[PDB]
C-alpha cells in the first residue's frame, strides 16, 4: 500500500555512506533489508586491473633490478586500485618512472574517461640504479573470476611477454541494515531501513540502490509471465 | 648504515668503531631468489 519515494542519501564519508529509503510497512522492512544486502554483494559493476605487461621481465616470479619490492608484491598492489570507467569498457593504461622516487596511483597518465579514486596508494619503491615501465589493462566485469577461467585473447605467442592477474573486483565490502521507527500520522505499524553501505569509491551510493532495484525486478518478473 | 636496498642484494656500511685498518666497509649480502627446496616448496628473501 506504501511505496518508497524520494529516498535520502546521508553521505558521512567518501567510503562509508548510509541511506534511509522510506518508512515502509511492518513485515516488509526486514524482508527488503536482507534481500538488498545479498544483491549488493553478489553482482555489482566494477573495474580492476585484468593483466599487466612489463617489457623488462619475462615471468612474475623473477624480480627486477632497481625496485625494492618484489614483482609478486607489485602485482598484489594493483588489485587494491579503484579505477572508474565512465564510457569506455576496456582501456589500456601506461606507467613509467625513472629515478629515486616512490610510485603511486597518481603516477598513471591521466585520461579524459579514466578517473582514479585513491592517490595515496603506493605501488613499489624505486632507486637511482633502476627504473620501471609497464602497461596496464583494465576491464568491466560483474563478479569474481580467476585467471584460469577467462581464457581468451590469446595466440600461443604472448606467454613470455604478457602477465595475467586475478580479477577480484568488488566495489561493495560491508553492508548493514537496521529497523528503525518513524511517524507518518497515518498508521501505527511503520518502520524504515537504514542501510550502512561501505563502498570503496568506484560507484556512487545513490546509483547502487537503483542498480540493485532493476535486477530484483527482473528476477521477480518470471513469476508474472 | 645501509647504503642501498635492492630486491636482489643489500649492502651496509661498517662503523668506525668495529673496523679494521684497510678495507673498512665491505659487506655484500646476496639475497636468494625463488629456488627449489627439498619438499618442492618455494623459498625467497625480501628486504625489510
Looking at B1-48, list the stretches that DSSP marks H as alpha helix, in order from N- to C-terminal side.
none
Co-location of A101 and A141 in the same domain: yes
For the beta sheet containing B9-12, the strands, ordered from the edge strand earlier in sequence to the opposite edge, are B2-5, B9-12, B28-30
Chain B contact probe: residue of A57, A58, A63 with most B CBs at under 10 A: A63
B18: left (phi over 0), alpha (psi -120 to 50) or beta: beta
In the 8-state DSSP scheme, what is residue B15?
-
Instruction: Measure in Å the smallest separation between the Cα of B48 and chain A Cα atoms.
Output: 9
| Residue-number span of the structural domain to which A66 is assigned | 46-169
Co-location of A183 and A102 in the same domain: no
Co-location of A107 and A140 in the same domain: yes
Inter-chain touch B46–A70, beta carbons under 8 Å: yes
* Burial class for A53, CB neighbours closer than 10 Å (0-12, 13-18, 19+): middle
* In contact, B12 and B1? CB cutoff 8 Å: yes
With an 8 Å Cβ cutoff, is B33 touching chain A?
A: yes
* In contact, A150 and B29? CB cutoff 8 Å: no
With an 8 Å Cβ cutoff, is A22 touching chain B?
A: no
Co-location of A159 and A201 in the same domain: no
Cell of A93: 593504461
CA-to-CA dists, residue A204 to A16, A117, A171, A172, angstroms: 11, 12, 10, 11
Indicate the residue among A133, A151, A169 that finishes a domain.
A169
Q: H helices then E strands: how many in chain B? A: 0, 5
Indicate the residue among A169, A194, A215 that finishes a domain.
A169
Co-location of A62 and A143 in the same domain: yes
Cell of B27: 659487506
Q: Which residues contact B13 (CB under 8 A, 6 or more apart)?
A: B1, B2, B3, B25, B27
Of A62, A65, A129, the CB nearest to B33: A62
Co-location of A107 and A211 in the same domain: no
Residue A49: which of A96, A73, A83, A94 has the closest Cα? A83
Co-location of A60 and A143 in the same domain: yes
Co-location of A51 and A97 in the same domain: yes
Co-location of A30 and A82 in the same domain: no
With an 8 Å Cβ cutoff, is A36 touching chain B?
A: no
Give the per-residue SS3 of chain A.
CCCCCCCEEECCCCCEEEEEEEEEECCCHHHHHHHHHHHHHHCCCEEEEEEEEECCCCCCCCCCCCCCCCHHHHHHHCCCCCEEECCCCCEEEEEEEECCCCEEHHHCCCCCCEEECCCCCEEECCCCCCEEEEEEEEEEECCCECCCCCCCCCCCCCCCCEEECCECCCCEEEEEEEEEECCCCCCCCEEEEEEEEEECCCCCHHHHHHHHHHHHHHHHHHHHC
With an 8 Å Cβ cutoff, is B6 touching chain A?
A: yes
Strand partners, A193: A179
Of B6, B33, B34, the CB nearest to A127: B6
Co-location of A144 and A174 in the same domain: no
Co-location of A162 and A186 in the same domain: no
Note the maximum CA span of chain B.
Answer: 46
* In contact, A205 and A194? CB cutoff 8 Å: no
Residue A11: which of A3, A1, A22, A19 has the closest Cα? A19
Co-location of A12 and A93 in the same domain: no
Q: How many domains are contained in chain A?
A: 2
Amino acid at each position: 500500500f506504501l511505496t518508497p519515494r524520494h529516498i535520502d542519501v546521508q553521505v558521512v564519508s567518501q567510503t562509508r555512506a548510509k541511506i534511509t529509503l522510506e518508512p515502509l510497512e511492518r513485515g516488509f522492512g526486514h524482508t527488503l533489508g536482507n534481500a538488498l544486502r545479498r544483491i549488493l554483494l553478489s553482482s555489482m559493476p566494477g573495474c580492476a586491473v585484468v593483466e599487466a605487461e612489463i617489457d623488462g621481465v619475462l615471468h612474475e616470479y623473477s624480480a627486477i633490478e632497481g625496485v625494492q619490492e618484489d614483482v609478486i608484491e607489485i602485482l598484489l598492489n594493483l588489485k587494491g586500485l579503484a579505477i572508474k570507467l565512465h564510457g569506455r569498457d576496456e582501456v589500456t593504461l601506461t606507467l613509467a618512472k625513472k629515478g629515486s622516487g616512490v610510485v603511486t596511483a597518481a603516477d598513471i597518465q591521466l585520461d579524459h574517461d579514466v578517473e582514479i579514486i585513491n592517490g595515496d596508494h603506493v605501488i613499489a619503491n624505486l632507486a637511482d640504479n633502476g627504473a620501471l615501465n609497464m602497461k596496464l589493462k583494465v576491464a568491466r566485469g560483474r563478479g569474481y573470476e580467476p585467471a584460469d577461467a577467462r581464457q581468451s585473447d590469446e595466440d600461443e605467442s604472448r606467454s613470455i611477454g604478457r602477465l595475467q592477474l586475478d580479477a577480484s573486483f568488488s566495489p561493495v565490502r560491508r553492508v548493514s541494515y537496521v529497523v528503525e521507527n518513524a511517524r507518518v500520522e497515518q498508521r501505527t505499524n511503520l518502520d524504515k531501513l537504514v542501510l550502512d553501505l561501505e563502498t570503496n569509491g568506484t560507484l556512487d551510493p545513490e546509483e547502487a540502490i537503483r542498480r540493485a532495484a532493476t535486477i530484483l525486478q527482473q528476477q521477480l518478473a518470471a513469476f508474472v509471465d | 648504515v645501509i647504503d642501498s636496498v635492492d630486491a636482489s642484494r643489500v649492502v651496509v656500511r661498517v662503523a668506525d668503531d668495529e673496523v679494521e685498518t684497510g678495507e673498512a666497509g665491505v659487506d655484500i649480502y646476496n639475497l636468494t631468489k625463488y629456488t627449489r627446496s627439498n619438499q618442492n616448496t618455494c623459498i625467497n628473501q625480501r628486504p625489510l
